[PDB]
UniProtKB/Swiss-Prot annotation:
This is Chemotaxis protein CheA. It is found in: Cytoplasm. The modification Phosphohistidine is found at residue 45. Residues 1-102 form the HPt domain. Involved in the transmission of sensory signals from the chemoreceptors to the flagellar motors. CheA is autophosphorylated; it can transfer its phosphate group to either CheB or CheY. The chain holds residues 1 to 131 of 671 of the full protein. Coiled coil: none annotated.
Length: 133
């Protein structure tokens, strides 16, 4: 059978999420080393792509969201305030839940809320209270 292509595709995404949690959980203790920010901004960028080729963009958008905070972190827009990373680790949390159901059935539909979980984090950083009247 030629199904081992997807069996290895996930075994790599899981070993990377941890490697990406070690980077993001070490990033919290070192949210400015610029190594955990690039070690994560990358894996998440690679994890997001692997989630698009799997037909699970709902879980890939989560990989792009986290990497987005790691992007502003590398773009000088945001920094790991222990909250932008908590929601990020929260995205990797659902990404795992989808992987647990995707592995149990292959569906990334966990009633998650990307546009929301991202807007929550996207608004949790760039803010402009009181603007133009």
């Amino acid at each position: 059978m030629m199904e081992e292509y997807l069996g290895v595709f996930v075994d790599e995404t899981k070993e990377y999420l941890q490697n990406l949690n070690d980077t993001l959980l070490e990033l919290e203790k070192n949210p400015e080393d610029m190594e955990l920010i690039n070690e994560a901004f990358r894996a998440l960028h690679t994890l997001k792509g692997m989630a698009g080729t799997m037909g699970f963009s709902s879980m890939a958008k989560l990989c792009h969201t986290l990497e987005n905070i790691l992007d502003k972190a590398r773009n000088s827009e945001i920094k790991i305030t222990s909250d932008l990373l908590d929601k990020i680790f929260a995205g990797v949390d659902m990404i795992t839940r989808m992987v647990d159901k995707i592995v149990s059935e292959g569906s990334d539909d966990i009633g998650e809320n990307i546009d929301v979980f991202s807007d929550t984090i996207k608004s949790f950083a760039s803010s402009g209270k009181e603007k133009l009247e």
